[PDB]
Amino acid sequence: QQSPYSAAMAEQRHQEWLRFVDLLKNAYQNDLHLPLLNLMLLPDEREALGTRVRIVEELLRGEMSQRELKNELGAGIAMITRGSNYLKAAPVELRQWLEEVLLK
């Protein structure tokens, strides 16, 4: 269970997140995803997301070394550990799909 205060906040955040997810879903369908994402994300946030994709890809590929991840993608040991933990916690279905699309 959860206390009513925390539960009320969590439900609000949940509904607000689903609204963003659905808004972006429809933007993709209307070819408006690029301007929507420029509106909703700062330039440095967009860059971070692009870099996180590369970190995920190289973690799954298994070829880049720790020094290379730091020097090429700015990912130190703490960030590599976090990213690896996120991948382990993700559903197997997502990980397998990521391997197919990113390591194509």
Binding string, residues 54-73; x marks residues near a second copy by CB under 8 A:
x-x-----------------
* Most distant CA pair in the chain, distance: 48
Contacts for 95 with CB less than 8 Å, ≥ 6 apart: 60, 87
Closest CA to 24 of 12, 39, 9, 14: 39
Q: Identify the residue among 2, 6, 26, 66 touching a second copy (CB under 8 A).
A: 26
Q: Identify the residue among 36, 72, 83, 102 touching ligand IAC (CB under 6 A).
A: 83
Contacting positions for ligand IAC (CB under 6 A): 40, 42, 52, 55-56, 79, 82-83, 86
